[PDB]
Ligand SMILES: O=P(O)(O)OC[C@H](O)[C@H](O)[C@H](O)COP(=O)(O)OC[C@H](O)[C@H](O)[C@H](O)COP(=O)(O)OC[C@@H](O)[C@@H](O)[C@@H](O)CO
Ligand SMILES: O=P(O)(O)OC[C@H](O)[C@H](O)[C@H](O)COP(=O)(O)OC[C@H](O)[C@H](O)[C@H](O)COP(=O)(O)OC[C@@H](O)[C@@H](O)[C@@H](O)CO
């Protein structure tokens with residue numbers, strides 16, 4: 001049984017993929033203790049991506065999907081089915097691992113009986129930013145969702161204990177193109193106890209209508225409110241309130257109301273947002289950061305003018 | 315007939331009550347020209363309050379209520395029934411009178427044929443604050459409600475002409491725990507003409523819910539304005555109502571409820587009561603409300619919580 | 630012997646001060662035989678004071694007396710149009726003044742540039758109604774554009790209009806409302822012609838200041854939007870949206886009672902006013918909204934939603 005399976009979807013990455021694969025093969029961890037599973041989502045770049053992968057024949061596991069799924073969920077699920085390791089680590093095909101990432105994260109996890117180990121993120125170039133607050137207290141052996149800002153770091157670019165995934169049948173969902181990674185991490189967090197944060201290095205380097213989206217958000221709230229770990233109803237309210245805050249600070253199209261979106265699309269978007277939030281108990285609202293009090297109430301009331309106004313006052 | 319009856323409810327005041335009673339008994343006014351009427355609202359502090367009062371036996375009038383009413387209204391009404399003086403003065407059992415208060419206020423009242431005399435308030439310690447603007451123009455023999463800020467000084471800690479109370483059957487009401495003193499003063503103001511303000515000293519020293527009952531009291535305030543036999547002109551009534559609305563928005567109970575930590579359902583119920591009350595007040599009064607409150611007032615009339623929240627964010 | 634210009638001037642109870650206006654028209658650099666002043670009195674009742682002034686210029690002006698006071702400039706202006714057989718007309722308000730070079734300079738610039746419309750720079754005397762400025766900030770413009778030369782911000786009829794455009798398209802002043810009928814006339818003209826000129830060498834026209842449910846007003850505004858959306862000149866639908874959006878902006882910047890929402894207007898009148906405003910705007914395609922200046926995004930949406938509180942709030946944030 002391998003210590004770690006690194007699971008990496010590819011699609012039309014081309015020659016730049018060398019740098020990523022190289023970062024995985026050059027680890028302090030013993031090469032025989034881990035594997036890189038590459039799942040190509042039917043690249044169509046005149047064989048450029050496949051030619052890169054072929055250069056590492058014998059050194060990686062590889063599966064080619066027959067059709068392009070359009071999303072990371074299907075290839076990630078494929079990778080999960082192929083892994084029989086102790087832990088999995090998801091890697092995006094443009095990113096880099098620090099040479100000490102697998103060894104340091106695995107060892108910290110084993111030492112602390114961790115279900116989840118989160119290594120400090122670094123970033124290369126302007127673009128998507130990375131979580132920071134989660135790493136500001138140094139190494140944490142037994143982290144807390146609220147106190148260690150975990151709902152602000154919900155990517156799957158982390159080390160997950162495979163048995164938790166298997167026992168709870170946690171799969172990436174394919175309903176929406178967005179936030180399915182958050183749902184996966186939330187489902188995992190709500191079904192496990194032991195989370196660890198490791199900050200010695202930048203272990204992982206990120207390299208730079210709403211029907212479906214809000215169905216995914218709805219699943220996030222459902223996962224919190226059915227958690228067998230966080231069973232206490234007031235605790236669930238606190239967690240839900242924190243997710244609401246994160247959604248208002250960082251969600252997709254957070255500033256839609258005053259945007260150039262067509263009126264009819266704003267109405268439909270807000271309608272989906274409103275329906276989703278109105279399934280979340282009002283008891284969670286007091287745990288939302290209070291600068292958002294008006295915006296949250298405007299969304300509950302499904303009132304576009306009031307959302308527009310709330311955004312002008314923020 | 316005494317010049318003044320000082321009416322003072324007590325409840326579990328204990329030893330500190332000495333200081334208050336002493337301030338009343340030590341006045342420049344001739345001791346035989348006034349009386350202190352103490353009405354105990356059934357203190358239950360192991361006889362501590364009653365023992366203080368007993369030390370002034372023979373020197374004060376005293377009545378013990380058999381049950382604790384829970385507010386000042388019942389003991390104040392008891393005091394009114396007991397007084398046959400020319401003027402009454404209500405005193406809270408923690409407060410102090412300046413030594414010249416009864417004489418100076420009475421004399422100013424008699425000289426100006428005053429129905430109401432208001433002496434300058436001082437305050438000791440943080441807590442409930444006192445009116446200031448009413449006293450910034452010095453002594454005023456014939457004050458005006460609007461120009462002399464009287465709707466911002468509606469406590470009953472004042473000297474009231476007893477005949478006005480008797481003829482108009484003005485009693486403290488007991489519906490709510492709050493604002494019943496405002497209602498009394500408003501009823502008095504709306505049934506009298508002559509008000510005086512005296513500022514030579516700090517004559518009186520203040521020493522530091524669904525809304526169903528509170529808004530019923532507020533409703534009575536507006537009714538008193540609109541049935542005033544003194545202020546009979548309808549436009550004048552609108553002006554007075556508008557001024558009360560302003561005071562309510564500046565100083566009312568839970569004025570900032572909309573963005574508070576109150577539960578949503580309680581905000582809705584509170585605003586519902588507020589809205590019902592305000593919507594019995596003619597819209598003709600709205601133009602006499604200080605105009606920074608125009609949006610907040612309209613939001614309340616529309617019973618629209620989001621709009622009230624927004625109005626408060628812009629104030 | 631078709632005249633170059635007919636100046637059309639309604640009068641009502643102007644009295645002795647009318648001398649100054651009439652004199653400004655008779656003292657032009659243009660040859661006196663090349664133009665005419667048509668005076669239409671809207672039944673003055675000032676003990677013959679206005680008529681006595683006009684009588685002093687008998688034989689130098691054309692004159693028509695209306696039997697009843699219409700109450701607005703539309704009827705007398707229409708009377709003037711029927712009487713004119715000139716190449717161009719120029720509307721003049723009875724309190725205002727023409728610069729001595731106005732008819733000659735504007736006509737010549739128009740003839741040189743085949744202009745349907747010539748706009749001379751406005752000056753103003755005394756505090757009161759203001760005059761457009763941005764339209765004149767680029768100097769002389771031979772072939773102006775409605776959007777780039779701010780023409781929707783200068784919609785008075787105090788301008789030189791080619792008469793054939795008025796005749797062919799049967800453009801008449803409407804009498805439904807007491808307000809904005811001049812805007813509608815200018816808009817109808819603009820939407821049925823191509824060539825506009827701006828002349829700024831002098832203050833050619835001097836505005837002299839002397840010291841409502843909305844049912845009719847918004848019906849007039851409705852006609853403005855209809856004229857834009859049926860323009861045979863601006864036929865492209867996206868261009869129509871752009872023009873409509875610009876008019877909406879002008880309406881929100883300068884319209885009648887623009888700040889009604891937070892005013893001391895009675896509540897029921899605010900509601901009725903907003904109701905008329907809302908009904909009118911909701912006949913204008915939402916595709917025009919992106920061409921409205923975006924500080925007005927909330928106010929415009931509040932009006933579309935017929936929501937008084939939201940209009941009040943929008944005005945507090947502007
Ligand atoms: O109001 P509170 O007290 O609750 O917190 C306010 C603080 O300011 C708080 O510390 C900040 O919200 C946290 O800022 P940060 O610098 O730690 O992190 C910012 C964001 O979390 C970060 O930039 C990303 O937006 C987080 O993305 P992920 O959690 O990795 O989401 C998964 C990702 O694959 C994707 O689903 C989304 O990123 C798509 O936008
Ligand atoms: O020109 P406007 O009217 O738009 O502006 C008003 C001015 O700014 C005015 O000067 C202030 O509103 C008032 O100035 P102030 O500092 O002299 O007065 C402050 C308050 O009136 C005062 O702190 C309290 O409101 C006193 O309340 P009272 O009317 O004396 O009695 C109420 C009390 O007995 C009780 O009923 C309530 O406190 C319990 O709900």
Ligand SMILES: O=P(O)(O)OC[C@H](O)[C@H](O)[C@H](O)COP(=O)(O)OC[C@H](O)[C@H](O)[C@H](O)COP(=O)(O)OC[C@@H](O)[C@@H](O)[C@@H](O)CO
Nearest residue numbers: 759760761762763764782783784785809811812878883922
């Ligand atoms: O369009 P944007 O958002 O990029 O910016 C607009 C500018 O900020 C500005 O508004 C423009 O340059 C125009 O400003 P202005 O100073 O040149 O002119 C202001 C107004 O156009 C003018 O003061 C009048 O309000 C316009 O009236 P008119 O169109 O000449 O005729 C209307 C009048 O005859 C009548 O219909 C009613 O106004 C009488 O009640």
Ligand SMILES: [Cl-]
Nearest residue numbers: 179250251252
């Ligand atoms: Cl999101």
Ligand SMILES: [Cl-]
Nearest residue numbers: 493565566567
């Ligand atoms: Cl109050």
Ligand SMILES: [Cl-]
Nearest residue numbers: 648652685686
């Ligand atoms: Cl002459």
Ligand SMILES: [Cl-]
Nearest residue numbers: 774775776777
């Ligand atoms: Cl244009």
Ligand SMILES: [Cl-]
Nearest residue numbers: 809883884885
């Ligand atoms: Cl207008």
Ligand SMILES: [Mg+2]
Nearest residue numbers: 305306938939
């Ligand atoms: Mg609203």
